[PDB]
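Sample 3 of the quickstart, ligand UE9:
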Amino acid sequence: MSLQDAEWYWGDISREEVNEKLRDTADGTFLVRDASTKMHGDYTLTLRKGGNNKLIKIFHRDGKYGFSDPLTFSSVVELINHYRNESLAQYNPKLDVKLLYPVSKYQQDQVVKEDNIEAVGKKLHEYNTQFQEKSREYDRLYEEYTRTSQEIQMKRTAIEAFNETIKIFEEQCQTQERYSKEYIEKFKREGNEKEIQRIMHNYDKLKSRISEIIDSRRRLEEDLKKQAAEYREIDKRMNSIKPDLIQLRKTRDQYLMWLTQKGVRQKKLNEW
Amino acid sequence: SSGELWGIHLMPPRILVECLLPNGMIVTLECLREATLITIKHELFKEARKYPLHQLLQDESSYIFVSVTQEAEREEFFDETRRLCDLRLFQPFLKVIEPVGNREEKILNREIGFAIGMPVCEFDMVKDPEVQDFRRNILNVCKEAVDLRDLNSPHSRAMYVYPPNVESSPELPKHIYNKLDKGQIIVVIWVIVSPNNDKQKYTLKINHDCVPEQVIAEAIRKKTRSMLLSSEQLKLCVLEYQGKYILKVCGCDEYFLEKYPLSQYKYIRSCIMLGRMPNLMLMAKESLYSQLPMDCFTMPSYSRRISSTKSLWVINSALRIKILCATYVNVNIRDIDKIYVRTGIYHGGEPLCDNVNTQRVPCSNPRWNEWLNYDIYIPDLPRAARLCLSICSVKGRAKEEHCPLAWGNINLFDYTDTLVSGKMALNLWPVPHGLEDLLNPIGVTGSNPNKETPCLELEFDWFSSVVKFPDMSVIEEHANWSVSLRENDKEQLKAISTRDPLSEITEQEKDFLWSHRHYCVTIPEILPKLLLSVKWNSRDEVAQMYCLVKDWPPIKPEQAMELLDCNYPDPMVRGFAVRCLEKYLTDDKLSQYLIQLVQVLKYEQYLDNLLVRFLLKKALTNQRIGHFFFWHLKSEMHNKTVSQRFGLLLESYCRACGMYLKHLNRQVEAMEKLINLTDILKQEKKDETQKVQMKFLVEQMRRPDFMDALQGFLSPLNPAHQLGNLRLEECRIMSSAKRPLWLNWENPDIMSELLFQNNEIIFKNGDDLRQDMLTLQIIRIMENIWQNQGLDLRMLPYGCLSIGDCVGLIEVVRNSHTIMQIQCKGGLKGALQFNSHTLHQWLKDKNKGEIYDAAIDLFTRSCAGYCVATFILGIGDRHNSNIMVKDDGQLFHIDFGHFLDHKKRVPFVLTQDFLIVISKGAQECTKTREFERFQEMCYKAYLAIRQHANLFINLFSMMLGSGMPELQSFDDIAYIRKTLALDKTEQEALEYFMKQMNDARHGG
Ligand SMILES: CNC(=O)c1cnc(Nc2ccccc2C)c(NC(=O)c2cc(F)cc(C(F)(F)F)c2)c1
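Result:
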C-alpha cells in the first residue's frame, strides 16, 4: 500500500504532461498526480472518458481519503483499487467507467544490455544526434515544400491568364472570319488580289502570334506538371519522416530515464 | 504583381502593343511606357486607317480597352487616364470593345481590387450561397455607417476621418496630476499669418480639464487683454472663435474636436507625463473641412437581385456519417503500412462524444465506404457542433505510431441553421508545422480551394425532409420542461471566479457550478467557468443554459473577450460577448485589442455573424481603427485558409470607407514598390556586392515614378504622420542578412519643427513580424496597467506592423544605441574584457549636470519594466545587441521575433553594467539604497501584472488560430501561468520572483 511505488502515481507532473499521456487513449485509462498547487497531501486523479481528460480532486481529512464530502478510505491505494474493481457510476451515473488501465512511471525502460553508464554517455548522445539530424531534414523539406507550393499557385494563375489571352485571340479569329468573309468575296470578283493579300497577311500574323502564346502556355504547363510532381514527392517524404522523427524523440527522451537512475545532471554534463 | 509585365520588372521606354480591333485586324502599336490609354486609343485609331476594313470601325469614343492582368482577370479599362505600365498586364496586348454596364462601378471595383490584392469579380463566380448572401447582407451595415457619419456634416465627417485620440477615462492618476502646477497645465498656441507664412505663438496656463473651446476662450481672452472690451463684447468674439476655429497638434494630423477634457487627449496626457510642452496650432474649420472631399456610397450591382422542414428535436436516431474514399494522398507505399481516417464530433475543443475511426486500409486504395456511428443523439447536437476529421498513417513495430496527413473541419449545421445531408466532398488542408495531434479542431471549417490536394468524400443521412435547428421558441419551453440562499457555498463560488481562464477545473467543481447556476448571476464574472461546466451533448442542459445567458448581467470587455476565443463557439454565448463590447468597449480599447478581435473572426463559424458586423460597423465610423482594421486583414490575404473571409470583409470596407480608399491605395502601391525592390535585392543580387546593391538602390529610388509613389502618402504605422519627400541622402540598405531598407522622409507639416522634422522607418521583407507586433502590443498593455496604478515605468512599444507574408514596417527610435554599440564606445579593462562602467560613463556624458538624476531615474524605471516584462513572457535571455538605450536614458528591447526563432540561460538580463548605472556607479552596487528601491519597483510591477493575469491569458488565447508557431495550443500559454505562478497565491509568487531576481543577479 505504498503510494510512492504505485504504478499510476507519477507525482510531480504538469497538466501538459498528463495530456501528452492520455492523448487518444481509450476510456478508462487513468493517472494520478499530486495537485498542481504542490500543497502537500493534496492530489488529483485524471481519467479518460468520452475523448476527454476529466480531472477529479482527492480530498483528505483526518488521514482518510476520498473525492466527495463524505470521506472514507484509509489510503489513496484503497480509494483507487476500489474504483479499479467497480464503477464510478457510484459517484456519477453519467460516469459509468471503471479505473481500467493505469499508465506507470517505469514499465517502459527500453534499455536492454548491461547498464554501463555509456547508455547515456554514448547511446543517448547517438540517439540525440540521430534526432537533430532527422529534425533538420524535416525542417528543410518543409521549407522547399512551402516554396514549391507558392511557386505552383503562381504558375496556376499564369496558365489561367494564358487561358484568357488565348480565349480573346480565338474570338479575334472568329470575328476576323465573320467580318472579313464577304469583303474577301467582294474583292474576289473585282479582281483585287492586292486587298485580299492585305487581309490574309494580317490574319496570318494574328494566328502566327496565337501560336507563339499557345506554345508559351504548354511550355509553362510542362514546368507546372513537372513541379507539381516533385511537390507530391516532397510531401510523401515528409509523411515518411514524421513517424520516424516521433519514434526517435520518444526513444531519446525516455533514455533520460537512465540519467534519472543517477538522479543528477552530472552525467549529461559530459555532453555539455 | 511582381512587375509591370509578367516576368518583367519595368517596361522599356518604348514597347510594341498588339492591338485587337473590333474588326478582325491586329495592329502593332509602338507606344511609350508611360502612355495613357487615352493616348493609346487615339493613336491606334489613327494608325488603324493604314489597315484593311477600316470602314467597319465606329468612332474612337465608342470603344474602350480590355486585356488580361497578371491576376488572370479580363479587366475592362474604363479609367482611360491610367498609364500603360500601371495596368499590371500579363502580356502587352489590348482588345478594343464597346463598353457595357456601369462605368463608375467598374472603375471603383478595380480600385478595390488593387487595395485588397485580388479582383472583386472572383467573388461573383463563387457558387457558395453563404458568400453571396454575405456580400448583400452586410451592405446595410455599410449604409448605417455611411448615413451616420454624413448626418451632421461636415463635423460628423471630420469626426470620422480625424477622431479624438483620447484615453478611456478623464481621471488622472495622481502621479500624473502631480506634474501639474496646482492642477494647471501650460500650453502654447501657434498661428500662421499669410503674407509669408510667418509663425507666432501664445503661451497659456489653464486647468488641465479645460475643453478645447475653453482653451480657445483663454487664448482670445489673453490677446484681447488691452482692447477694453465689455463682458458681452468679449463673449461675442469668444463665440466667434469658438465656432470658427479648432486646435491641431503641431507636426501631425491630430485634431481636438469633441470637447473631452483637454488632459484626456493622449497627446497632452503624455506631455504631462513626459513634462514636455504641448504645442497646438489654431486652425480654421473651413480649412479643415476643405481637405475633406465628399464621398458617397453607391449600392453595388449584386446588392439587389437574384434570378416543408422538420426540427432537429424530432429525429429519433443516433448520429452516423459515411466515409467514402480519398484522393491525391501523398504517401510512400513501402515506408507506410496503412492509412485510415480519424473523426470526432467537437463543440469548440471538447469532444461531444468519443472518437471513431474507419478501418485501416492500404495506401494504394484509399477507399472505405464505412458508416461511422457516434455516441450522441441527433437532438442532442448543439448548434455549434462540428465534424473534425483527418487521414492518418501508421508505422508498426517498439511502439506503433500514428501521424496525420491532412485535416478538415465541417459545420454540421450551415449558416441557415439546416443540418447537412447527402454526399459531400471537401479538399483537406496541410497539417501545420509542429502539430502532431491526429486532428485539428481549432482549424478553420471549409474545403481547401488549392487544386490537386487530398479530397475526402462523405455522405450524411438524408432524412425524409430538410432538417433545421429548433427555433428559440421551443428551446425555452424545453427548459421549462427540463427544470421540472446558502453561505459557505457562496465563498467558494467567488473563490472560483478569481482563478484564471486556464485554471484546472475538476469534475466536482464544474457540476457544483451547474448546480448553483442560478446563483451565478450574482457573480457574473463566473460565466466562462459555468459555460465550460455545461454538458453540451445534452439538449436539456444547453436549453436551460440559453435561458441563463439571455438574462446574464453584462461583464466588462476584458472578460467578454474570453467568450470569443475558440472554447466558446455557441452563437448565443458569442452574441452576448459582442453586446458587451458594443456597449462597454471604448474606441480606444477597441483600437488596442484590434489584433485579437480580428483573429477571433477566424473562429466564427459562419461569414455573417454579430462580431464581424460590430467590427465592420466600428471600422466605418472611426477611420483610425478602420485603418488598422484594413491592414491586419490585408496582411493575411496570402493565407488561403482565410483569404475568402477576409477578402469579402475588405470588399465591403473598401466599398464604404469613403475617399480614404484613395489614400490606402497610395500606401499599398508604396509598399508594393518597396516589396519588389527588396525582392530584386534578395533574389537577383544575393551574388553581388554590398556597394553594388547600394548603387542600384539609389538609381532605382532616383527614378521619377518611384519617387512619385514613395513621396507624399500617409505612414501605415500611424496615418496621422504624413510622409513627404524622401531624404535619399539618408536612405540605405542594412547589414542584416535579409537586407531591409532604412527609409527617411521629411515631415511636410507646416510646423514640423515642433514635433519631428524627418521621419524614418525600417521596411523589412523576409521576417515574420506578427511576433513583434503581439509582443510590442503586450508590452504596451503592461505599461498602461503600470501607469494607471501609479508605477511610472516607461516602456517603448515602438511601432511595428505586418503588411503581408513576412513583410512589414518598424519604427526607428531616434537618438538610441544598443548596449553592444555603447560598450564599443568605451575601452577594455580586464584581459579582453569590456569596461562594465562604460555604460554609466556614456550616460553621464550624455546627461551632464542636474539632468543626470533624471536619466538615472529613467534608466532604472525602464530597466525595471523590461526586466519584469521579459521574464513573464519568457523573453529574458537577450543579447547585448538586442537591448537598446536612448541618450535620454530610456532602455528598451528589440527584435523579439529574432529571439523566438533563435530559441529553436537566465530569468532576465540584469547585467552588472545595468547595476552600475542604477546604483550611480557605486561599489557592491547590490547593497545600495538605489538598488533597494529598484528591486521593489520590479516586485510591485510583477504583482501588478499578476493582478491582471486574466487579460493577458485571454489575449494570447485569442491568437491561437493565427498560425503563429508560438501559439498552436493552450499548452503553449501555460508558460505564463508558471512565470506568474498562478497556481500559487501571492506571497509564494512574490518569493518565486524574488528568487528569480537573485538568479538574474547571477549571485546573492
Ligand atoms: C526561453 N523561453 C521559453 O522557454 C518560453 C516558453 N514558453 C513561452 N510561451 C508563452 C509565454 C507567454 C506568452 C506567450 C507564449 C507563447 C515563451 N514565450 C513566447 O514564446 C512568446 C512570448 C511573447 F511575449 C510573444 C510571443 C509571440 F510573439 F509568439 F506571440 C511568444 C517562452
